[PDB]
Amino acid sequence: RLTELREDIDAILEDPALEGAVSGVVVVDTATGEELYSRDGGEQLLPASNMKLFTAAAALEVLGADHSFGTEVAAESAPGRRGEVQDLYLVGRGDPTLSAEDLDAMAAEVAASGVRTVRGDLYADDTWFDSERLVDDWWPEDEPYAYSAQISALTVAHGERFDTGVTEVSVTPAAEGEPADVDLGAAEGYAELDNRAVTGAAGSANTLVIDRPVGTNTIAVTGSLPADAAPVTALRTVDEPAALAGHLFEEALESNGVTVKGDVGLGGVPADWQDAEVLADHTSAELSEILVPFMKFSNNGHAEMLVKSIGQETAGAGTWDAGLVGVEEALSGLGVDTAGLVLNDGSGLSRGNLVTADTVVDLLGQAGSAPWAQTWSASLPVAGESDPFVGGTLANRMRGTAAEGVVEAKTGTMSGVSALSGYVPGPEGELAFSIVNNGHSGPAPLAVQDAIAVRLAEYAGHQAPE
Ligand SMILES: *[C@](O)([C@@H](C)NC(=O)CCCC[C@@H](N)C(=O)O)C(F)(F)F
Ligand SMILES: [Mg+2]
Ligand SMILES: [Mg+2]
């Protein structure tokens, strides 16, 4: 039955959608170590978001499953009878899940501690990581979009998915001829607005564009929204995520009865502060719980923050240079051969990343027999699962196939780069696989990837749910 499988994958790989593409495909039985299929497995390819597999495993080795993240509010000394402080500091230490609600709860704690007036300025301290916001080879044209958000120690995460360093723009039509209404979300009064957008006639064509022009903190809205059209919402990144957090914190303080008399800006807690008074703190959920929104939806910002958190633990440097070496060592310490790996970031957004399909499968084996294996696999998207927090990037794929509910795999997609890697659990044995496509021209060869993943589920002894 093993020859039948080899013939089937050979035929799937001759799909015309893979014209001019190099594709690494490796399948291994983890119970035996048997190499069921291998094609260009040593070839170096861009992984896209399959890079997160390496990042996640390294984070669980370096930081541990029980690891959580802190944010604190600091003043030089406690407030007195008059309840006055001078300068106040919001200090972030790499929480990727810090919501506006959490800023509110910290504002309430600052009020309940006796502070009524912040007489000086309020500062956002994100010096726990460096101020290098973006990886060198990331494309400037990508910068307005959530997956390309700037990386900071102090950032506000949006929604239940915890998209960091962004704001929600909402555009609403008005009457035909009148300007569209633009709602900047959290970045209201932080980011500049350039609204050139108009409301078009009922039934006219939607031509609405929402942009942040490179190197500015301005949201430029252009084009035309039809009068009868549904409101358009989009996540856009801001410049200096910590400063936005600072902005949102002032609003939180002012709403909890604390007057801020000064300005909002960046600044680290001064060195000459003898014994800083912690007026409020927040602790995140543990890394095992954080891994879910991170891996399920493939959060880029989370990955880069984790890398720099690795840099802090291994070296006390919230730095790409440190964290990426930290990732490499952690993988080596796990039993993974890192020869074919080139690490340029944690998210896989960098086109300077390189993996081989063998290395991915190697990692999947070593991860499978690790103490944190269950929190590891619980994070991976599950083929065909309706629940977005279970299905993830695989939620609307492989439904009604042998793979549905069974295959746990990480996706990866950019221009000319597509990947699918994970496990096929079968009664006799757990299968591990990697599929990495580079150079194809159409859209991601998802049909090809799904066909292989389904055939392997069938091989492992599964049938399609009906
Ligand atoms: C993952 O594959 C990540 C790395 N990909 C993206 O976030 C999309 C990046 C777009 C880059 C753009 N310049 C291009 O199309 O090449 C995953 F799963 F998150 F998508
Ligand atoms: Mg939303
Ligand atoms: Mg505001």
From Swiss-Prot:
The active site is at S49 (acyl-ester intermediate), K52 (proton acceptor), S298. Disulfide bonds: none annotated. Its main location: secreted. InterPro entries: Beta-lactam/transpept-like, Peptidase_S13. It comes from the Bacteria. NCBIfam families: PBP4. One of its GO terms (molecular function) is serine-type D-Ala-D-Ala carboxypeptidase activity. It is an enzyme of class 3 (hydrolase). One of its GO terms (biological process) is response to antibiotic. This is D-alanyl-D-alanine carboxypeptidase. Pathway: Cell wall biogenesis; peptidoglycan biosynthesis. Keywords: Antibiotic resistance, Carboxypeptidase, Cell shape, Cell wall biogenesis/degradation, Hydrolase, Peptidoglycan synthesis, Protease, Secreted, Signal. Coiled coil: none annotated. Inhibited by benzylpenicillin, cephaloridine, ampicillin and cetiofur. One of its GO terms (cellular component) is extracellular region. It catalyses: Preferential cleavage: (Ac)2-L-Lys-D-Ala-|-D-Ala. Also transpeptidation of peptidyl-alanyl moieties that are N-acyl substituents of D-alanine.
